[PDB]
């Protein structure tokens, strides 16, 4: 039973949420290998844990940059939520700690690369291929939303393909535990629901709108609303006229009209029947929800794996020395990390 599985998941989550793991490793326990990704106030590196020989992805956030960008609370959210969750399609946090300069979150290394990379290269995914990925997101959001979590940054750049061809969601930087409404303007322009753009209070329905954007992008090869500059993107989103490629199936277009729905009383995911409106839609009729969860479905695409620690499925980024100051920076701000 789903309700029973979700109630026990909540019990597990709540214990960790109320008593977060803290200071479970140290920087000197890892060898830093290569940069896998970069952001505004940090980077993620491939590292090897010397005691086990396991490879991990280490997210290193500069405390001073976090503060400058007013992402303190968001970063505390990210670590507190990530250490508490447990789901097959969420990248697992293994360790966290901090030093004088930086915050560190050490996570499972997912060697197949970002969905983004494969999607751009290949161009688009077939509807069955897209449906396979989409089902995993639907179940992940079912899980997260049940814990009163909104994710708030669904995009192909945050979805990693594992050695079995299944998705792992990463980056909980905008994730938040909220009952009822919140107001922060955040996300990625192409994926923002109209409520967010219009500065209304919003809720978990913004994740379901974002799923619509992801499915469209996977199946079309480009998102439903794009332009050279974000303001032009926002104009397109708030007008809400979506045009579908002629190759989209009838079922696909109907699902997307119900996800990309400006009207919150009509948006799938947000109605009295909840996620079951999505799970029971015609486009998902061939999806065995149980088998997806269990990883028993054969994946449409399996990534090339050259060995442990291989980064061939990732782009190259400029490397920069990790500096640890001899003075503690921003101690009070990150006390609970």
């Amino acid at each position: 039973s789903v309700k029973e599985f979700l109630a026990k998941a909540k019990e597990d989550f709540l214990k960790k949420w109320e008593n977060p793991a803290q200071n479970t490793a140290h920087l000197d326990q890892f060898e830093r290998i290569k940069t896998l990704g970069t952001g505004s106030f940090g980077r993620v590196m491939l590292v090897k844990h010397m005691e086990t020989g396991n490879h991990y992805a280490m997210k290193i956030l500069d405390k001073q940059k976090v503060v400058k960008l007013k992402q303190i609370e968001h970063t505390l959210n990210e670590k507190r939520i990530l250490q508490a969750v447990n789901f097959p399609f969420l990248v697992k946090l293994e360790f966290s700690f901090k030093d004088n300069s930086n915050l560190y979150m050490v996570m499972e290394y997912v060697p197949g690369g970002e969905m983004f990379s494969h999607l751009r290269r290949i161009g688009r995914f077939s509807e069955p291929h897209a449906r396979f990925y989409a089902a995993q997101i639907v179940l992940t959001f079912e899980y997260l939303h049940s814990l009163d979590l909104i994710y708030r940054d669904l995009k192909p750049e945050n979805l990693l393909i594992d050695q079995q061809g299944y998705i792992q969601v990463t980056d909980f930087g905008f994730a938040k535990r909220v009952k009822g409404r919140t107001w922060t303007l955040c996300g990625t322009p192409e994926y923002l629901a109209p409520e967010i753009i219009l500065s209304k209070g919003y809720n978990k329905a913004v994740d379901w709108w974002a799923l619509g954007v992801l499915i469209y992008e996977m199946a079309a090869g480009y998102p439903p609303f794009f332009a050279d500059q974000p303001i032009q993107i926002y104009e397109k989103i708030v007008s809400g006229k979506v045009r579908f490629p002629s190759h989209f199936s009838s079922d696909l277009k109907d699902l997307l009209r119900n996800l990309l729905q400006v009207d919150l009383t009509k948006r799938f995911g947000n109605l009295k029947n909840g996620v079951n409106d999505i799970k029971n839609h015609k486009w998902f009729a061939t999806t065995d929800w149980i088998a997806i969860y269990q990883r028993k479905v054969e994946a449409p695409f399996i990534p090339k794996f050259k060995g442990p620690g291989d980064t061939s499925n990732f782009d190259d980024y400029e490397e920069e020395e990790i500096r640890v100051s001899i003075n503690e920076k921003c101690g009070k701000e990150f006390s609970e990390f």
Binding site: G39, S40, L69, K70, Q71, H74, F116, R120, G123, D153, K155, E157, G173, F174, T184, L185, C186, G187, T188, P189, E190, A220, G221, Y222, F226, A227, D228, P230, R243, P245
Partner: peptide, 20 residues
């Protein structure tokens, strides 16, 4: 084509997060 318009756009690379 819409594909052509996308590929010619400045938003085919990794898209950064926005916040207020």
């Amino acid at each position: 084509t819409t594909y052509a318009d996308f590929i010619a756009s400045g938003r085919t690379g990794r898209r950064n997060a926005i916040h207020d």
